[PDB]
Amino acid sequence: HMSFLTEEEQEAIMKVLQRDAALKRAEEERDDYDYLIKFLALGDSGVGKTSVLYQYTDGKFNSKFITTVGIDFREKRVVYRASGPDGQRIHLQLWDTAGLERFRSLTTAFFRDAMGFLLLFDLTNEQSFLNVRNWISQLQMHAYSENPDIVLCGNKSDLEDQRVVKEEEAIALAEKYGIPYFETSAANGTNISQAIEMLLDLIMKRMERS
Amino acid sequence: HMSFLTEEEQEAIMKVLQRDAALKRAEEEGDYDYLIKFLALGDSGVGKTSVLYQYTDGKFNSKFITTVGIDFREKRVVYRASTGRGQRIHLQLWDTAGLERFRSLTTAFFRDAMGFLLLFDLTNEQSFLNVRNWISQLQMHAYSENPDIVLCGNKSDLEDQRVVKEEEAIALAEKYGIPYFETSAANGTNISQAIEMLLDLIMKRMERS
Ligand SMILES: Nc1nc2c(ncn2[C@@H]2O[C@H](COP(=O)(O)OP(=O)(O)NP(=O)(O)O)[C@@H](O)[C@H]2O)c(=O)[nH]1
Ligand SMILES: Nc1nc2c(ncn2[C@@H]2O[C@H](COP(=O)(O)OP(=O)(O)NP(=O)(O)O)[C@@H](O)[C@H]2O)c(=O)[nH]1
Ligand SMILES: [Mg+2]
Ligand SMILES: [Mg+2]
What we know:
The structure is a homodimer. With 210 residues, chain A is α/β, with parallel strands linked by helices. Chain A contains 7 helices and 7 strands, in the order E-H-E-H-E-E-H-E-H-H-E-H-E-H. Chain A has a single domain (7-209), classed as Rossmann fold (3-Layer(aba) Sandwich). In chain A, 39% of the residues lie in helices and 22% in strands. Chain A has a 6-stranded mixed β-sheet with strand order 3-4-2-5-6-7, with helices on both faces. In chain A, strand 3 (71-80) and strand 4 (88-97) form a beta hairpin. The longest helix of chain A has 23 residues, at 7-29. The relative contact order of chain A is 0.17. At the A-B interface, strand 1, helix 1 and helix 3 of A face strand 1, helix 1 and helix 3 of B. The structure holds phosphoaminophosphonic acid-guanylate ester (GNP) (2 copies) and magnesium ion (2 copies). One phosphoaminophosphonic acid-guanylate ester binds at residues 44-50, 61-64, 66-67, 97-99, 154-155, 157-158, 184-186 of chain B. Chain A: It is found in: Membrane; Melanosome; Late endosome; Lysosome.
């Protein structure tokens, strides 16, 4: 399989890298917040990574499929409270990777910048669920820490008539790898905040203990 | 200069990334004091892979094997401040492809670099004229405002084919305030010096933090 990038696509990717470098250089000055926290969404093409992040940052949802050109990221400013009987201002950088195999090496090159991973499959696509095992072993091999923080999302929960992944099977996978699991919908917002706030909690607690 | 990627090339790149992650995970788990990373860049053919290989192994291959996107080498060295006490340094030497079809992938590794070894080929005028473009790329894409850069005019052993005048290269390096070495990966001339100068810049910038 040969893949290609047009000039326009190379241009778009370089712009993402340019925005990223500008963001990191501005943290080197005022590191208007307390932490820059970075995580990365991954999983098969079409499962809803881009929609999930857009629902989270803007509360909006597009029906039209615009497959991601390699890599992108979004930003959000949130307040984090140490979960338990406890406010830190968090600048979130949300990396959005393409799922298509043609972008595997480019997207894996950004794992080094990720403190945690939002891993998606599509509740209506059984193969995307069967590939979760491969995504996890790719994360074991390519993450830059031992035992990376991962939150698993079974997305498109609003499409009940098309659901093919049984809750029991997804639960069994989450227990086997010891990772949290949420069933989400980027269309209506269900559990989006909850899944991403849990990932942020995992990251913040791991830093405090280090 | 159409941008394409094959499956076998992705596999090779993914192996480098796998090696990289293993190295980073092993530093977090010693035998040295710092993991110091820098990155070689410049036009295809100027000798980036050759320079790093001469430095780490004292060897040189005549045959051109263009780099498949990205690679890195390693070396364990002792660094002395300016003297000072010997610090054990684990070097990770990133090697980027110069061809445009790898530009996005290679630029994605600037973030891991504490310093840059920028090469042109003393026998290739185009590679010298592209130096200012590479410096501009580093300003736009490095993850600090004034990245440390050492400029190498490589292939100094090819005297009859030399076309870049030393005065012009010295003046270009002085304009940007970067050190300049004329190197040969074939016979080793100035390789150690240029890379030790880059390491010095990085270690001294850290000490001031
Ligand atoms: N009904 C419904 N549709 C969704 C949901 N999430 C995504 N979609 C739809 O599914 C399609 C794929 O979504 P998209 O976010 O682009 O997926 P992706 O994971 O980013 N794909 P890629 O990796 O190729 O960039 C789009 O048509 C989008 O509208 C969801 O929760 N519910
Ligand atoms: N005579 C001589 N040949 C050199 C020198 N440095 C590199 N070469 C030769 O020039 C060719 C290109 O060298 P190479 O290190 O592969 O260049 P590169 O910068 O890594 N190219 P790429 O970006 O495509 O990977 C090879 O044939 C190599 O042997 C040098 O100092 N002297
Ligand atoms: Mg997408
Ligand atoms: Mg090379």
